[PDB]
């Protein structure tokens, strides 16, 4: 079946992802990447306090990153290497804004410990005349590894669970990332231990496998949007906001 | 009935707070640690100080991890003519510096409880267990200095409402505090005990690395020095003349630790108003290390918490731990250069 | 039945009110005061957005006030005249603390509009040798009335729904205060209207009907604690925290 019928509305389907007071669309189905099974709820294990999450409020879609994709970028050059708990907060905090100001962060302010699966969209608007390729990959503990520069390479992450994005026919990388840390919970700020590496479950990272191969005088620049949903969460550990921690640098 | 549970169910005393009408609306009574390894120092006398520990203290002194829920019985000896209200809150995530900067208001932010007392003296608060870790490793790891991780959190007991005592019952009242494993204090894995005997409290000092003043600086009494807080505090001197300050050997301490001194025999210590059995050693800037006598071991530790915490000597926080010069007393010299032993603790 | 048996534990019952991660007790049953029926949920009327409340977090018991009761206080002298939405926030904000810091306020920071019933405890620790009396009274719109100074009197509030507290046998005033404003919702900050009188559903106020009548050299001072539960709520209206409003003065 192939009859093209673009009316006053150029025809084509648009799948949407609402899902909680925010609707974000994608005109092209994503290339998913599921690195692990869905995480069970270990609140009834580690902590016996206010055991809950926040539905309509922390299970939304906030923006955490956005960047540029150009012909200048050589073969393996990561556009982002963003930590995943974590840079949800660390993006907003360095936006000359506070964590307290946004609805998808506020319990991190009050509550001490967090556990939950993650959802991520790597949406880009590239043109059909751009011949490039990216790869969004996940690593459940990047900073803990010593020589991960060895792994920090397009070759290395192809070896593992990832998603693929090609400039033409742009395209989205779905990226379901459930919770798998060593300890079942994460600490939102400084704690009797975890005096650093606060709220870090691993980093995402997008490098390049094919530069934007542009014709003579073709459009140079491109762009990426990183979105994140925090579903299936649990926030036990009620603590005043003066105990909080404005996350570390990029 | 020889169970780890059987033991962690008896209620052993651990604290005694004196509550008074004079206690302000905003005031704390105790800020003791919410973990089985909660101490109670007993006075005297030998170097290593003895400590009181609940049945839920002796275990898991044998185990590595515990993961349990605990509870505190606050026995408030009170008439029916005494009324007040106490708070108590388990706030997880209490680091070192953040243990202060703590009011009774921000405690009301975490799991907390308020108790009304007229004709009902005592109450029992069950201590919640909030961690990122399933089980919880030893706070005191013996015998190994850096192999010991702090407590997961602590509870406080503020005065929500000051006491109002009618003229025929006294205004100060004792708050005895007991501690035992709660409904589910668990215990994980047997390892080296962090507690010792009480039978023979000796330690043959190896080898023979007994800490004592450099050869030639004996005897030594507590005195003052114009170069040490402008003669406002006590420091060990080996003479009464110009700049005769006791020079002490340098103590090599690994990072993440602190050091101070407790003498072996109190019958050989320098004398002021009391035997200066405790002291701290730090460089003097005038090209050596000086022996600074303290009131007790706690005040020697707290000084090491501030000098090894990357501090100076001319800070007010340290100079309020220095012993005042009106404590110099008759100024008895020591019994030669008696043995001190170097204590160690993480910071 | 009257056999007194005060053992090592002086005997007597202690009723408790937990209820959500905080337990507060009262050794003497309260004198309740219900001024209105329970409010229905009008979220499915005024606003069609994220329709929810926050259970374990805003349905707790925070302290908002505390004060002194002495013999010096003449007949009708209000110890507090505290606004009720409102001073839950206005107490903390003037405590040199932020709204963002405490768990029982954080949705007010993010969310624009609020509706919900209120719960209040006026607990005091007075001695059996003190012969005084207070009265906690509620008024669903105090600031809207012009000459309410006329009403601002112990006589006037006795005319209406209130609770009674006597110094001896101290004693608590339960004070269930459901939502009854003119408009079914309240605005958390400045809004296209409500440019002032932000988040005000009415004020509570405790005056004196009997001073602390103390014997020669009897205990002079006393004290009150005001607690507040915010149950049966609804917070529709998601807004960034830079739009927020640090409430007005006492």
Task: Give me a quick take on this structure.
Chain A is of the alpha+beta class. In chain A, 10% of the residues lie in helices and 20% in strands. Chain A has one domain.
Protein architecture, described:
This is part of a larger assembly, with two copies of chain A (250 residues) and one copy of chain B (347 residues). Chain A has 250 residues and is of the alpha+beta class. Chain A has one domain. Chain A is built from five helices and eleven strands; from the N terminus they run ββααβααβββαβββββ. In chain A, strands 3-11-5-8 form a four-stranded antiparallel sheet. Chain A has a three-stranded antiparallel sheet with strand order 7-6-10. Chain A is globular and about 60 Å long. Chain B has 347 residues and is mainly beta. Chain B contains five helices and 14 strands. In chain B, the strands form four sheets. Chain B has a four-stranded antiparallel sheet with strand order 1-8-2-5. In chain B, strands 3, 4, 6 and 7 form a four-stranded antiparallel sheet that branches. A four-stranded antiparallel sheet of chain B has the order 13-12-11-14, covered by helices on one side. The chains are: A alpha+beta (250), B mainly beta (347). Chains in contact: A-B, A-C, B-C. The B-C interface holds B 21, 25, 78-81, 83-85, 105-106, 108-109, 111-123, 160-167 and C 6, 8-14, 18, 21-28, 61-63, 66, 92, 95, 97, 101-103, 123-130, 170, 215, 217-219, 221-223, 225.
